[PDB]
Design a protein around this ligand. Structure first.
Ligand code: CLA
Ligand code: CLA
Ligand code: CLA
Ligand code: CLA
Ligand code: CLA
Ligand code: CLA
Ligand code: CLA
Ligand code: CLA
Ligand code: LHG
Ligand code: A86
Lengths: 168, 179, 161, 160
């Protein structure tokens, strides 16, 4: 009846069979928008953040030969140019069209009865294959939580430098 | 439940910790695949190093010794500056070319599942559980594919790896045993 | 109680001068093997370190980008004087990550304590009879006992001169 | 009502002048006792601190790499402000890991503290005498209860 997370507003409907469910939706976005799109968004925002949290830290100390070491990760695009930056994002596109067999909008995605949120088919090593349901639910709670930590993280790493002018 | 191990003696050890508790049967395949890749790479490297040390280069074995063909990069000069300090003298063009072939092979090992490339998929065939078994199917004039051949190949692989590692170490710094 | 266990061997055998397993005051039937094995494993890599790390075989190159070579770094507690203090933390830290992430019973199939890997010191070892375990796990345990008296020597004799 | 509990020793017995466990709740006693036992010994280590410190007993050597020695350190509240800024961080850190590690032992209010063998040292709860623990835990509480009034002396007998 009431929310588990914040126990003085009403419990959000149509968020029941999802992994990180603690009933946290005070602004009611899940009442208005499709829940499969919102989950798929939250996982993708989290995975890009987790890669950017490693990136922001490892870029200070490791630099690949041919580039210029930049003291602050934030100043890296200027030290790589625009041609290299566009190559990254245009290939990200091509990797995204192939990803969802061409269904790339909020109307075409999740039009098949298959295609559950976050299941890319990606598993080269075999992590979580042939196991039980409780274990699968547990490992999915870890990807959400670490991704949510990394989103609020990748703010702070990027923001710290905004004010100041030196690395992490 | 993996393939044959050490012939003189056997020991699996660090295998059930990831193919039962950490991972599963899909990880087993992947691991073997990686091992085979590394083995083959090491073998080729070993052969190359051996050839370089011996002396059988273009100047000794053929009529052509001018690799650069514009950058004045003869084979004699590259055969007189060891094996580790020779790979850095390779022209960028050539480097690019080499990266190309390898890239193509890797992509094939990734797209072309079985007989032909797969046009529609969420991810690449080899990026899924058990995506790359280890065998690419490249068997020109295939003599045999038995249970002995595989084991022999594997053994030659690890041996080659160790050998080349040792070789590199010795060129770089005091190793341990003789060469 | 534990007179027939690993480590009791001639000439002494079971020899507890303090009365340590004489009761369970703090559950002395367990963890005292684990506390005895753990110090010695440090000491065995220390003394096979420190004697080779006295003989004069060095790594090539420099400890950093600023040109400080490894050959300029002597042996002993003097070697930590020529480690800059950023190194002293990271030398502890990713070893300290090993204490909480590999230096514990991870999978739960440990026959013993110090039993973490199961398969990689299997040195043609599966053939050998269960008795060969008790031999080279006494030989593990008693190298580690005797390498502490090696390393406690080679730490105190440096400060004594 | 709330008698025969831990540490109600008689020079008084039933120390409740104003109804504080009864008008607290059903259970604040389970908080309050956990709350009291921690306050008692932080006072004890304050009393055993501030006395052994005042006798001049110091650790031989320096506290940092810049040459600040322990014998250059006077006492009172003038010694926490002297140990350096980074030196205070590593104090507070593996303290702050351990109000995390001890409050969350799969039960919060049933068992008390979360005994000192949490880290680097290991505890046995099985060796567990019924009669021996009533006196020894009620010494221990009542040592700290006097130590709190004792440390409240030496914190307040500095300012006046
Ligand atoms: C780099 C090596 C390489 C190899 C060997 C091939 C080989 C092949 N391609 Mg691919 N391809 C490649 C790179 C490669 N391609 C690259 C870089 C691209 C662009 C990214 C493509 C784009 C592509 C497209 C769009 C198509 C193919 C097609 C095909 C197959 C022909 C169609 C068919 O019916 O055969 C099937 C083969 C058999 C029935 C015989 C099976 C026997 C096995 C052993 C294969 C032969 C051995 C193996 C190919 C050798 C590789 C080992 C390596 C070390 C040399 C053929 C197997 C067509 C296809 O397969 O789909 C219809 C096709 O439409 N290719
Ligand atoms: C990158 C190459 C590589 C890879 C992926 C593997 C992978 C594997 N090997 Mg293996 N092996 C290798 C190289 C490799 N090996 C070499 C060089 C040798 C010769 C010494 C051997 C000798 C060997 C034997 C004798 C057997 C295997 C077996 C196995 C399988 C089970 C063991 C396991 O879980 O992994 C092993 C652990 C890892 C791959 C972890 C990676 C190592 C870490 C990350 C870094 C280590 C760096 C190290 C310091 C390099 C110096 C060399 C070392 C000897 C000091 C597994 C598929 C067994 C098998 O087939 O099943 C029973 C088996 O019988 N291997
Ligand atoms: C100029 C800067 C600088 C300096 C002074 C050092 C100095 C040192 N590094 Mg090092 N390092 C540097 C840059 C630097 N590094 C860079 C840019 C990287 C890449 C991330 C590393 C990555 C690195 C690793 C991975 C390790 C060291 C380690 C060490 C120390 C060995 C200490 C020891 O054995 O205890 C006496 C040594 C002091 C070791 C360490 O401290 O841990 C170690 O294992 N270094
Ligand atoms: C100082 C080096 C060193 C290190 C890091 C280890 C570390 C370990 N040993 Mg080893 N061991 C050592 C010296 C060492 N041991 C010595 C000197 C001996 C002879 C007494 C042994 C004999 C030995 C045996 C017989 C076994 C181990 C096993 C193990 C593992 C528990 C752990 C990884 C065990 C293993 O593979 O299973 C976990 C195992 O059965 N050790
Ligand atoms: C095992 C982990 C560990 C490690 C690597 C260190 C390392 C260090 N501690 Mg220490 N410390 C530890 C555990 C540890 N401590 C514990 C468990 C405590 C008790 C809570 C303390 C309490 C402590 C104090 C009180 C002080 C240090 C200080 C220092 C540093 C000297 C820095 C300096 O002079 O600037 C180069 C040194 C890096 C000193 C410091 O940072 O002052 C600048 C300092 O005053 N430590
Ligand atoms: C205002 C004081 C206060 C109070 C009354 C509590 C009360 C509680 N804490 Mg707690 N805690 C506090 C401050 C406080 N905390 C502070 C300042 C920290 C450090 C940030 C923590 C860190 C902390 C951790 C890490 C854990 C607790 C847990 C718990 C619960 C233990 C019983 C349980 O599982 O309930 C059943 C559930 C209702 C209990 C409700 C535990 C918990 O929430 O487990 C579910 C646990 O492991 N606390
Ligand atoms: C960040 C550093 C770090 C951390 C968190 C731990 C953590 C631990 N160590 Mg430890 N240890 C470390 C570094 C570390 N170790 C190093 C670098 C050494 C010396 C080379 C030791 C030597 C050591 C010994 C000798 C013992 C521990 C023990 C312990 C355990 C309880 C200690 C309280 C715990 C798992 C003790 C243990 O097993 O108690 C249960 C134990 O006997 N450690
Ligand atoms: C504000 C005024 C005031 C009052 C009324 C008292 C009252 C008392 N003091 Mg006290 N005292 C005060 C200020 C005061 N204190 C100040 C400013 C200090 C710091 C010097 C102390 C430190 C102090 C000590 C050290 C002692 C007292 C003691 C006493 C008691 C006799 C009595 C209860 C005695 C006491 O409580 O016995 C242990 C005692 O020995 N006084
Ligand atoms: C350099 C990168 C180029 C490589 C192209 C990569 C191809 C992408 C993979 C195709 C999907 C195949 C999967 C199933 C195949 C499939 O059926 O899906 C086809 C896909 C739409 O599929 P669906 O029809 O299932 O999608 C839902 C539709 O029914 C709409 O309701 O459309 C495309 O393929 C677009 C391909 C990109 C076209 C790029 C051209 C660039 C035009 C941009 C113009 C810029 C204008 C600037 C402003 C003026
Ligand atoms: C119990 C115990 O002890 O551990 C256990 C557990 C543990 C350790 C995990 C185990 C394992 C797995 C292991 C040991 C895995 C190790 C794998 C290993 C060691 C893999 C090396 C590859 C080398 C390559 C690819 C080199 C290529 C070299 C190439 C591609 C070259 O180009 C060579 C080159 O020269 C040419 C030809 C010409 C020159 O101009 C250029 C250079 C110089 C570059 C085991 C087996 O279970 C045993």
């Amino acid at each position: 009846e009431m929310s588990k997370a914040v126990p003085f507003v009403k419990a959000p409907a149509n968020t029941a069979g999802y992994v990180g469910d603690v009933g946290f939706d005070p602004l009611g976005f899940s009442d208005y928008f499709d829940m499969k799109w919102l989950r798929e968004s939250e996982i993708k925002h989290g995975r890009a953040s987790m890669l950017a949290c490693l990136g922001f830290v490892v870029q200070q100390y490791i630099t690949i030969p041919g580039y210029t070491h930049v003291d602050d990760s934030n100043l890296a695009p200027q030290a790589v140019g625009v041609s290299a930056m566009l190559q990254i994002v245009l290939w990200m596109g091509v990797l995204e069209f192939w990803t969802n067999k061409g269904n790339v909008t909020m109307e075409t995605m999740f039009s098949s009865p298959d295609r559950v949120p976050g299941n890319l088919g990606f598993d080269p090593m075999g992590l979580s294959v042939g196991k039980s349901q409780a274990e699968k639910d547990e490992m999915a709670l870890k990807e959400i939580k670490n991704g949510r930590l990394a989103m609020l993280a990748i703010g702070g790493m990027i923001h710290h430098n905004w004010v100041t002018g030196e690395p992490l | 439940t993996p393939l044959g191990g050490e012939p003189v003696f056997i020991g699996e050890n660090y295998w059930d910790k990831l193919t039962l508790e950490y991972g599963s049967e899909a990880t087993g395949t992947y691991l073997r695949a990686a091992e085979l890749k590394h083995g083959r790479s090491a073998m080729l490297a070993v052969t190359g190093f051996a050839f370089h040390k011996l002396g059988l280069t273009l100047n000794n074995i053929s009529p052509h010794e001018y690799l650069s063909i514009r950058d004045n990069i003869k084979f004699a000069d590259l055969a007189a500056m060891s094996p580790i300090e020779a790979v850095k003298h390779i022209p960028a063009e050539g480097m690019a070319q080499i990266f190309a072939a390898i890239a193509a092979v890797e992509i094939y090992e990734l797209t072309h599942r079985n007989g032909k490339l797969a046009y529609d998929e969420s991810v690449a065939p080899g990026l899924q559980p058990g995506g790359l078994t280890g065998d690419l199917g490249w068997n020109p004039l295939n003599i045999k594919v038995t249970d002995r051949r595989r084991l022999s190949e594997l053994q030659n692989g690890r041996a080659a790896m160790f050998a080349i590692s040792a070789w590199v170490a010795a060129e770089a710094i005091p190793g341990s045993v003789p060469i | 109680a534990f007179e027939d266990e690993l480590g009791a061997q001639p000439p002494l055998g079971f020899f507890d001068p303090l009365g340590l397993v004489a009761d369970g005051d703090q559950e002395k039937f367990d963890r005292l093997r684990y506390v005895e094995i753990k110090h010695g494993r440090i000491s065995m890599l220390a003394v096979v370190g420190y004697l080779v790390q006295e003989a004069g075989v060095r790594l090539p190159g420099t400890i950093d980008y600023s040109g400080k070579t490894f050959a300029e770094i002597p042996n002993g507690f003097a070697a930590f004087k020529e480690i800059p203090a950023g190194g002293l933390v990271q030398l502890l830290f990713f070893i300290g990550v090993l204490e909480s992430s590999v230096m514990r019973d991870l999978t739960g199939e440990a026959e013993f304590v110090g039993d973490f890997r199961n398969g990689a010191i299997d040195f043609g070892w599966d053939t050998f009879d269960e008795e060969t375990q008790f031999k080279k796990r006494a030989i593990e345990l008693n190298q580690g006992r005797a390498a502490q008296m090696g390393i406690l020597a080679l730490m105190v004799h440096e400060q004594l001169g």
